[PDB]
């Protein structure tokens, strides 16, 4: 039903490009890839996408209180109004903003260390119906912003 | 030499800035001095008491034909039933309403009880409270001073939990049903409050830089909201079970806005605000009076709203707790415990925080009394009881904290007079020792010395480090023990009532010392509390 | 009288123009111990500012200084304690704590001694002009 | 207040403005009578009114089936109000009233039963009676006030010295600080001490004097009709309870009355009246080409000198608000900005005047014109507390106005307002500097390439982005390691540069040579407050080349000269170092305004410390090309300061030291050519030092 820590999930978009609801999911490789990218899950009947570079582990998810503590140095539920620590399941690395541009946005890929704001992504539900202060459930809509660059998961 | 030049430079500097404003003192202007004297005389002297006259004037007004007071009430009613698409100032309301609201060891208590009842008759026999109700339906979400006047009058009527008024108001709702009324209740509940500490940092930085009419920050008149909730409480004290079910259900109109869940997530929002006030104040360990005062205000808010919460469920009319079974209350309580555990440590430090500690422990007390009132309709394995189990489960660590916290002054209450704790250093005067006291307590096969260090937080810290073997000790003795008795009652009721909960077995033995401490003090019976069950109590 | 206020003026005429801006005022008061606000510091100025050039000119400064009280004799009276012809060593090191400045034992013992030309172990009434 | 009472006041020292009516002139005064009314012989009628009513009461004493218009209400209602109006205009001098009151007193009129609407008239009369009575109670305390502070100021501030001159008064720790406070604060505990010098017994009597016939009966009159005569027309019934409440709280009326009063000297009393007459003139024209008569009056209020002297009174008038709703009553057309122009003038005259205007931007922000937004910015122009006092969601509406700017001109004024909103003191408030970027996360406005594209292809979008470059560098985190030793302002410091490169040389060097007098400096602070000597040369002679010599070429560049005398004083912290001295000495040759040149003259000797130290003594001979020409007096103050520069750079000295001694002989020769002479009397020692430790329209 809901979502706590240490449970396994993917993200996905359904980008309707050329009016095709392309069920493209996130995909970062590691071990020689320092970037995330996409992965189509629409044609499951003939091209099964790989899952391993798409699974992501909810290591932690607190508010500003705990966050400030960590920077100033088994089922915690995950809340609209939290920034979380998210690991890549396969590589073990930690997804974050990357400080290059390839326009004036910022790149997206793995890193090791949990220091800095980069490994933190604040959760906002993109509806008035949901709001901050309650658990994230099965299959909810959400908006993630960086904490280093404070730009959107775009 | 050079230090002489430094002293003369600072000397002439102090003399010059003295010459800037010392002798300038109301100095020139006759007109301005007169004017400012008038302003001070205004701000000081006017400001007095004449104010014994009004109830007398009520008694003059309660005189014969129609009574003129009743004419006035009729005026305000007809004023209320005008449809002005919004509400307005009308200062004469703002005079006369609180004029009436001005107008409200055993035997004498009964006597003044009857005199108060006579006053309450003396108004509401003239149909007084209906226009209060009308006005409150009349504005919608607007929180004007008009609304404050109405709420003051409504509580001043309903002060004793007068049943008669509750009947009248229910019947008023019955015939002339106003979805707009409870609509207005929800809207008035809606914005209504929260402390917003960024503004606190703005003003505290301003006290860094402005040296100034402050205090407007605190939840934007918290007090009015306290009055609203006390009005809700004194609406249903006396177990107006019909009224409790109506406030759930509101059936006679078209629609229903269940105000219960409204005040639930309201106080959830209040909880959120105070929990982030902790996440602010988690590190700085010293609070000056401003934040302390804002704490105390919000504390009274929490106390009031918990009393409303009880009074919804206190007559165990099932639908309240049925709705509240699916409330979002539980996690807010969990975060409350998370507040309490960490708060009590840093509050339990010095001469300052002790008052605020009393505040927290007392709200803590009747907070748990709330879920005691929740608890009372259980059968064998409480479904609701299991909700209490599960919300207890996630609140483990703080529960360990608070149980240690009770164990501290509990074992203080144990050792506090044994002569291997009393005649240890002295015979006894109160002045005993630090380290002999310390090794006394430690030599009692009793403490890891962490507990002693927390006990040696201050314990006197006055020149001698001998404590007061009674005063600090009596500060600890009772004043955290009732709550432990309450939660003991609670968890025993759970475990006894719903058995076979393994984690609950862990929880109960996990501070079993206080339970067996309180076994001299509980009492239990069994009765048939009109559900024809053996309802033990 | 005349120059003793201009010496008091040029001590506070930091920019050296004959006019005292309001930033000049809190600059001294934050080196004198205080930390006043500009919305207060202007209010130290504007009542003195009767000519209304925005700042404080010396002829308005002069007559303002004239009604308070030489500055030198009471400055020595902060220095001089009882009147035994000299300022004793512990007496002079007690003068500095009234303006709040702290000291050690070594620093002013040479400052007496770098002023103690005659060598009497104290600072007499004469040595307020030899050091100044 | 009392003979050891009756509302026949003789004195009546209030103001209650004058009534000089126009004659019924039937000549050319048509729009020149224009002020009052046709007039008429009043005091015939005041005889008639007493003649009428006292008869009419005695004619109504029988209460016959007679009465004139059929009813008493046909009779009495057109009488009493007509009298009451005639009561209002300040006639019936008390012996007139003495008979008139004894009609009303007898102590009869109230003793009659009367119908409904007459007492609706009649209640206003006695209501009017309490007011002048309260005025009489008010005017009484004025006389108590005058001598008493005259007793008090002559007591304490004199003796306040006599404690401090007994203390010294150059020391002021606490005892002088006891009577060192604000003026109201000095009056605060001074009055409040007596609430817990024997002269406070006079006050102590006075409060009890001003505690307290009519106040009895006024209550008793209502409860006649309140009892007996169950009443229709609730506004009548409303009106009665006022007076009863006004009876049983007479005190609270004094409370609200107290911040209306004022005391002045006898000279200023005229400039009250004409202003006061023209005041209510504006209050008169509230009820409506429908602006033209106002506009002349506005400046008259401005033209008062008794307009600054009692400023809280005008605030206590609230007359601004009378303008304010009128402007709101406009906003539902050309003369609008006058009142605006009054308003932004108005609030600005004091901090507390700015204070009361602060609440009204909340409206006023919604009201763009093309000005009212000046006035919206006027009450937040400077004040540091007010920078904290404001709120965020308003600013979104400001940037909503910027959000629609997807073309334009019109965004350009919000930024100037917001530039006031975040800096206000020379001091960037970080709270406002925090919030301004957050909207820009969700709102954008190769854009910086287009700046020189505007240099060819109406002047506005040059300036429009030039405000944007001001405010961003205005919303820097801090000015120090305050910014560095910090948290997450560093995160915006990246945002301060993840958005902008250096880049700006589209404007930096380019607009520094050809807008030009301002917008180059619109860049400077941003690179300063956000972004050692590599960037000197990387940006050297950028403007500093064409600026330094063009002094005789006035005139926007000669206007532009002090507009960048801020600029070179900012970086005051290897071949082209002489090229900076080329850019330096020519402006020093141009300076051979002036105070801003004296600000730029502070950029001269500070460069001498950072001065390859060989290039300083060589370029000082260019000063020696003018140092014999000293005795250009500004040049004579310059090289005398630069004479210490070779006295500074002498330690590396110990080609040009030969004739420098001849220039020192010419410095002896300038001393052979002659306070202001002390500008060289110290400089000869530096001329001795430059010879000494170095030896250790052209
Ligand atoms: Ca100046
Ligand atoms: Ca001046
Ligand atoms: Ca001695
Ligand atoms: Ca000596």
UniProtKB/Swiss-Prot annotation, chain C:
Major subcellular site: cytoplasm
- The domain of life is Eukaryota
Domain named EF-hand is located at 1-35, 36-69, 70-102, 103-132
Q: Name one GO cellular component term.
A: plasma membrane
Q: Which residues carry this modification: Phosphotyrosine?
A: 86, 125
Q: Where in the cell is it found?
A: Cytoplasm, Cytoskeleton, Spindle; Cytoplasm, Cytoskeleton, Spindle pole; Cytoplasm, Cytoskeleton, Microtubule organizing center, Centrosome; Cell projection, Cilium, Flagellum
Signal peptide range equals none
User: Which residues participate in Ca(2+) 1 binding?
Assistant: 13, 15, 17, 19, 24
User: Where in the sequence is N6,N6,N6-trimethyllysine found?
Assistant: 102
Modified positions (N6-methyllysine) in chain numbering: 102
Residues binding Ca(2+) 4 are 116, 118, 120, 122, 127
> Does the keyword Ribosomal protein feature in the UniProt annotation?
no
Q: What is the effect of changing residue 116 to G?
A: In LQT14; reduction in calcium affinity; not changed protein abundance; not changed structure; significantly decreased thermal stability in presence of calcium; significantly decreased RYR2 interaction; increased ryanodine-sensitive calcium-release channel activity; decreased of KCNN2 calcium-activated potassium channel activity; not changed KCNN2 expression; not changed KCNN2 location at membrane
Q: Which residues carry this modification: Phosphothreonine?
A: 37, 97
Cross-link Glycyl lysine isopeptide (Lys-Gly) (interchain with G-Cter in SUMO2): residue positions: 14
The answer, when asked if Acetylation is one of the entry's keywords, is yes
Give the region (Necessary and sufficient for interaction with PCP4) as residue ranges. Answer: 69-132
Q: Which InterPro entries match?
A: CALM/Myosin/TropC-like (IPR050230), EF-hand-dom_pair (IPR011992), EF_Hand_1_Ca_BS (IPR018247), EF_hand_dom (IPR002048)
On this chain, the residues bearing N6-acetyllysine are: 14, 81
| Activity regulation | (Microbial infection) Inactivated by S.flexneri OspC1 and OspC3 proteins, which specifically bind the apo-form of calmodulin, thereby preventing calcium-binding and activity.
Q: Which family does it belong to?
A: Belongs to the calmodulin family.
- What function is annotated for this protein? Calmodulin acts as part of a calcium signal transduction pathway by mediating the control of a large number of enzymes, ion channels, aquaporins and other proteins through calcium-binding. Calcium-binding is required for the activation of calmodulin. Among the enzymes to be stimulated by the calmodulin-calcium complex are a number of protein kinases, such as myosin light-chain kinases and calmodulin-dependent protein kinase type II (CaMK2), and phosphatases.
- Output this protein's name: Calmodulin-1
Question: What is the species of this protein?
Answer: Homo sapiens
